[PDB]
Amino acid sequence: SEQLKCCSGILKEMFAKKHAAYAWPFYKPVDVEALGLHDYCDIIKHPMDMSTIKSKLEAREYRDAQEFGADVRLMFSNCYKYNPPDHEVVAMARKLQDVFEMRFAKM
């Protein structure tokens, strides 16, 4: 229970104004109808995003912090898999993942 409270706090920080300039691509599910994304679901078998993670915390779907962390890392991994490594969204992902990993390590 205490683990999951910390997970909620980590996600709240990831949604916070101070990180918004690089966190915003991850707020909502990737829009697969947008121009250029017609192949997203062919490449990414398990989409994930911060609003879906929030809804799962609110439904108590995660039984512990490790399950929550797996979905956060899935979100970042999907970004690293789909996009070219030099893409601006990958640099944003690395920054937000640093925010996450330092908090998740220290809970």
Binding site: W24, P25, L35, G36, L37, D39, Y40, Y82, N83, P84, H87, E88, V89, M92
Partner: peptide
Amino acid sequence: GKAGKDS
């Protein structure tokens, strides 16, 4: 894939 983002 994804375009230049910035918003």
